[PDB]
Amino acid sequence: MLKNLAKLDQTEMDKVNVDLAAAGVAFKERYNMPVIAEAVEREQPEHLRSWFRERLIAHRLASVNLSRLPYEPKLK
């Protein structure tokens, strides 16, 4: 109703944060700069290891697409 703590929930955002790390691993194409597949993997809590894996496919799509919607202008 008001308290809304259940929304921000450290676990809720934990889940969202893990994907970002996964995306970072997709920066392995950009391995012309430093990317540690070990680190990202180990940064993700083994508990939800599957989540990293599943998200990895998602981030693979997002890596190969290139698009991703960067900055660009585009304003009404």
Distance separating alpha carbons of residues 16 and 8, to the nearest angstrom: 11
Tokens representing residue 14 in the block: 């934990």
Assigned CATH class of 1-76 = mainly alpha
DSSP state of 70: -
> Could you tell me which of 43, 35, 39 has the C-alpha nearest to residue 63?
35
**Residue boundaries of the structural domains of the chain:** 1-76
Residue with tokens 């993997």: 41
Integer-rounded Cα radius of gyration of the chain = 15
* Most distant pair of Cα atoms in the chain: their distance: 49
Please name the residues in contact with 19: beta carbons below 8 A apart, sequence gap of 6 or more.
Answer: 55, 58, 59
Cβ distance 20 to 44 under 8 Å? no
Distance separating alpha carbons of residues 19 and 50, to the nearest angstrom: 12
Distance separating alpha carbons of residues 24 and 18, to the nearest angstrom: 10
Distance separating alpha carbons of residues 24 and 35, to the nearest angstrom: 8
Experimental method: NMR
